[PDB]
Design an enzyme around this catalytic site. Structure first.
Site, short mmCIF file in Angstrom:
data_model
loop_
_atom_site.label_atom_id
_atom_site.label_comp_id
_atom_site.label_asym_id
_atom_site.label_seq_id
_atom_site.Cartn_x
_atom_site.Cartn_y
_atom_site.Cartn_z
N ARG A 188 12.03 2.41 0.00
CA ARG A 188 12.76 1.48 0.86
C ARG A 188 11.86 0.40 1.41
O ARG A 188 12.21 -0.76 1.39
CB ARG A 188 13.37 2.20 2.07
CG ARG A 188 14.77 2.73 1.86
CD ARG A 188 14.93 4.08 2.60
NE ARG A 188 14.08 5.08 1.95
CZ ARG A 188 14.45 5.79 0.89
NH1 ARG A 188 15.65 5.63 0.37
NH2 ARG A 188 13.61 6.65 0.33
N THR A 189 10.76 0.77 1.99
CA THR A 189 9.94 -0.17 2.69
C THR A 189 9.29 -1.20 1.80
O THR A 189 9.33 -2.35 2.09
CB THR A 189 8.89 0.58 3.52
OG1 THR A 189 9.54 1.54 4.34
CG2 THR A 189 8.11 -0.29 4.32
N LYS A 246 -13.36 1.01 -9.65
CA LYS A 246 -14.75 0.58 -9.86
C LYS A 246 -15.64 0.86 -8.63
O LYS A 246 -16.81 0.50 -8.61
CB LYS A 246 -14.82 -0.92 -10.23
CG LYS A 246 -14.22 -1.32 -11.57
CD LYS A 246 -14.05 -2.82 -11.58
CE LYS A 246 -13.41 -3.32 -12.87
NZ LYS A 246 -13.70 -4.81 -13.12
N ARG A 256 0.69 -0.06 3.87
CA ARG A 256 0.96 1.34 4.15
C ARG A 256 -0.26 2.17 3.71
O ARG A 256 -0.78 1.98 2.61
CB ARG A 256 2.21 1.83 3.41
CG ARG A 256 2.50 3.32 3.56
CD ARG A 256 3.87 3.70 2.96
NE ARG A 256 4.93 3.37 3.91
CZ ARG A 256 6.20 3.76 3.82
NH1 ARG A 256 6.63 4.49 2.81
NH2 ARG A 256 7.05 3.40 4.76
N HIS A 294 5.41 2.99 12.62
CA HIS A 294 6.16 2.31 11.58
C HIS A 294 7.02 1.26 12.31
O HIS A 294 8.24 1.42 12.42
CB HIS A 294 7.05 3.31 10.84
CG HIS A 294 7.55 2.83 9.52
ND1 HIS A 294 7.53 1.50 9.16
CD2 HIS A 294 8.10 3.50 8.48
CE1 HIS A 294 8.04 1.37 7.95
NE2 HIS A 294 8.42 2.56 7.52
O1 LIG Z 1 -16.33 -5.52 -12.88
C1 LIG Z 1 -17.29 -6.16 -12.42
O2 LIG Z 1 -18.16 -5.68 -11.70
C2 LIG Z 1 -17.45 -7.66 -12.71
C3 LIG Z 1 -16.17 -8.38 -13.09
N1 LIG Z 1 -15.21 -8.31 -11.98
C4 LIG Z 1 -14.00 -8.91 -12.03
O3 LIG Z 1 -13.56 -9.55 -13.00
C5 LIG Z 1 -13.16 -8.77 -10.76
P1 LIG Z 1 -11.76 -7.73 -11.01
O4 LIG Z 1 -12.27 -6.64 -11.89
O5 LIG Z 1 -11.37 -7.34 -9.64
O6 LIG Z 1 -10.79 -8.57 -11.71
C6 LIG Z 1 -15.58 -7.80 -14.41
O7 LIG Z 1 -16.15 -8.11 -15.47
O8 LIG Z 1 -14.57 -7.07 -14.33
O1 LIG Z 2 8.69 9.35 4.82
C1 LIG Z 2 9.62 9.61 5.59
O2 LIG Z 2 10.24 10.68 5.61
C2 LIG Z 2 10.05 8.57 6.65
C3 LIG Z 2 9.59 7.11 6.43
N1 LIG Z 2 10.27 6.55 5.25
C4 LIG Z 2 10.20 5.24 4.88
O3 LIG Z 2 9.55 4.39 5.48
C5 LIG Z 2 11.04 4.88 3.64
P1 LIG Z 2 10.10 4.77 2.17
O4 LIG Z 2 9.11 5.88 2.20
O5 LIG Z 2 11.13 4.87 1.11
O6 LIG Z 2 9.50 3.44 2.34
C6 LIG Z 2 8.03 6.96 6.35
O7 LIG Z 2 7.39 7.10 7.43
O8 LIG Z 2 7.52 6.67 5.23
#
Ligand SMILES: O=C(O)C[C@H](NC(=O)CP(=O)(O)O)C(=O)O
Ligand SMILES: O=C(O)C[C@H](NC(=O)CP(=O)(O)O)C(=O)O
Ligand SMILES: O=C(O)C[C@H](NC(=O)CP(=O)(O)O)C(=O)O
Lengths: 310, 310, 323
Positions: free
Chosen positions: A66-67, A94, A115, A143
């Site tokens: 839901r959220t 990584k 969350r 929440h």
């Molecule tokens: O992974 C690394 O350390 C360097 C380089 N990092 C990135 O491209 C950033 P990302 O993996 O978050 O897209 C890569 O080649 O994936």
């Molecule tokens: O998880 C529950 O029972 C109640 C409450 N539920 C929600 O927020 C709905 P959902 O988990 O579908 O986003 C929560 O705190 O996550």
């Protein structure tokens, strides 16, 4: 609904949302009226283009239907866009830290919806993010947007919030939903009476009740602890708000039989998802508001996103 | 007035991007200028509608946070759309080949963004795709858009790319980022000096150095290996570009104490994610540009996407 | 771009719910959408409308072409993923449907259980499009397959078509055989499969009235004989649906082996030398080794173009459902 104005709620502009404690009575009413107008326009099939070119990124480190979905839908229905970042296929594999991950998504986005299983995780995010972060659930803590949509639901179904008797039922200890909701209700409204219905092990925690003591006393709010849905509870409550046992952090069942003890003018609520605490036999009853509750959440979340990003 | 304000770089039109080698100095300056114009408009809150009705599909066969997200955000900020194809839930599980998978997304999309653990997978994808493919990382090979955004970061932070002394530090063997960056810088700029800071086992591969032979001689670029981040490297470098040990493909740590040897005016860079090689004690330092580098990434990818699809 | 009015606000469940007139109006709308998209035109028809995919099993084409179709209409997509959802907290399928129904204009649903779509129908207010229910049906596949035949060959009436491979578990050939036979004047259908994987009775029997009164020839073979290759205007071939046979039982082992051992159904370049000049090879995809890459360069190989016809048919569908 074409002639309704959509004034953003100014006190929310550019701010992160972490707690139900953040809001005044006037903020809440103004969010309620805004959501109501959002609902009117969307239902009439009107197309909103308020947030064109603004990006929301969901950061969901625990499960959600839901959220996650209501936030995405709400963003889209405002004309906004979503970047679908997913933890399990991310650079966390990584060795990236939570803080660097926030910084990363914060580089691209206008708002983050987060969350996390750790209660302290959103303060951590807050300390490194430039853009607003909306708390979609921080462990067993809070929440705050559930609280807002829950109140919207109450107001739209029953017509007012002041003067109600409400039972919060089930796992009150780990239910972040009932933490935020009680705070939001007791702080801003003249609640008549609150039934806290739970087995002793799962009662509403002291860290929620205590900061409320001044408001409970000055407004004369009646707090009544039980371990069952007694006849008294069934007969006085205008709202029965029940919850799932929060198993992942480790009588009271409502079915149609139990429901013949209830008042004519009342609603049954559940933030969802449910297990056996809330029987499908209740689903056909007009007083079953837990499905409508979900739609209200999208419109409240539209009121919130627009107010934050206006 | 897009063609004044955001003129696309015509040389990129309709073409795939595979290597740092395919770009001239004039391409890179044109992309940098377009990128910073992108930045100016987005930062002022202007909405771009250049790529409405056009689709980018990510095809990530390895993990990513930065590259995936910034491409998705860049596309969105241009007015275009993303189809969120995920490998793990695809018909690859029914036994579909890579080539068939590419033809499939090529059928729906205007541009594909591809990251793959195999070095030759980009060339296999090119042999069947009709639409441009942007190499977002091919095994230990290249990361060409990372080299572009790294060069934008240097130019924007320091004002100049010609004449700099740059240290490339960490896992240079498996670092596809430093493979592309070294190519891009040495082929198109007159770099004063490069320090390659790595033990021999993780040194810059011969297949990167050898083809740069002509440019190294013609421009008189100085190149030294060191096995550690020495005082000389610290004191002479305009740019400290450090990298993560690419564990999944098988002292140099920068911290506040080491930073006490750095020039007053210089930058520390890292394509991210980081492990222990780049201490969080560096984050508060004005010379720490590895967070701003992520944001230049988005704007460079806007400039690239617009140029490919205009 | 006029919407096909009969589809308005309605769920799509089975190939049985369409008329001939429905099909041609979708075909023409699909081809009109192709004209405009290919000319670079941008469509704003569904701005502010939301499609949520609910896929409980794997997909590349159906998922991606529905998303792309929705986008090219100006619509949007909420990227709901089962793996990281509140299903993990014990939520039922019904409650999941009602949840996404609260936010979306249309749900596109694929589920390994045949009866799941019906259950979803009983709780949801907004239209649900069956993107595949177990070994049951795949109604929008049949529609796009018919668009492909129509565009490639020019005509659907009078064709001879071979349905080849795993006909038992092939939800595509289930929908296609109903769509063709109910609404067209088909000359002949070759059911080419090993016996263990033949077209099911629960597909053929409801069609028997139409088969007989239209005088459609039904011929069963377990091989691509010269007769099948020389007569067929379309060779529609399928993947073995291994995932429907994951029991480790002898019944499953026999069915799984029969595909290669009790039939001769591979299409390669050598085999294509037997085919007529004016025909197409089709495959809903993905393929394993039943359809060789040596066929890919043949002008008669229509299975990649078929994916693109798929996006345009799905635009015509979404627009007609949501107009
Ligand atoms: O992974 C690394 O350390 C360097 C380089 N990092 C990135 O491209 C950033 P990302 O993996 O978050 O897209 C890569 O080649 O994936
Ligand atoms: O998880 C529950 O029972 C109640 C409450 N539920 C929600 O927020 C709905 P959902 O988990 O579908 O986003 C929560 O705190 O996550
Ligand atoms: O799976 C098959 O072999 C045919 C058919 N395939 C498709 O629909 C393509 P997909 O899985 O890629 O969306 C199916 O029933 O899923």
């Amino acid at each position: 609904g074409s002639m309704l104005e959509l004034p953003p709620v100014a006190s929310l502009k550019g701010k992160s949302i972490t707690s139900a404690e953040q809001f005044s009575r006037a903020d809440i009413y103004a969010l309620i009226h805004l959501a109501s107008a959002m609902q009117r326009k969307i239902d009439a099939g009107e197309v909103l283009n308020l947030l064109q070119g603004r990006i929301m990124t969901p950061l969901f480190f625990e499960d959600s239907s839901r959220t996650f979905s209501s936030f995405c839908a709400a963003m889209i229905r405002l004309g906004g866009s979503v970047v679908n970042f997913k933890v399990e296929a991310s650079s966390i594999n990584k060795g990236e830290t939570l803080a660097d991950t926030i910084r990363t998504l914060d580089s691209y986005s206008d708002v983050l919806v987060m969350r996390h299983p750790r209660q302290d995780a959103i303060e951590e995010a807050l300390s490194v993010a430039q853009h607003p972060i909306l708390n979609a659930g921080n462990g067993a803590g809070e929440h705050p947007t559930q609280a807002l949509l829950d109140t919207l639901t109450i107001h739209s179904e029953l017509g007012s919030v002041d003067g109600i008797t409400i039972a919060l039922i089930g796992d009150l200890k780990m239910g972040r939903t009932v933490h935020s909701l009680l705070k939001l209700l007791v702080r801003n409204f003249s609640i008549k009476c609150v039934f806290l219905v739970a087995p002793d092990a799962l009662q509403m925690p002291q860290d929620v009740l205590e900061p409320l003591q001044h408001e409970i006393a000055t407004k004369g709010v009646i707090i009544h602890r039980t371990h069952a849905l007694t006849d008294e509870v069934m007969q006085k409550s205008d709202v029965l708000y029940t919850t799932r046992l929060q198993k992942e952090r480790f009588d009271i069942t409502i079915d149609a039989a139990r429901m013949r003890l209830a008042k004519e003018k009342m609603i049954v609520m559940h933030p969802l998802p449910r297990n056996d605490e809330l029987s499908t036999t209740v689903d056909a009853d007009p007083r079953a508001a837990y499905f409508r509750q979900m739609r209200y959440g999208m419109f409240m979340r539209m009121a919130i996103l627009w107010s934050v990003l206006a």
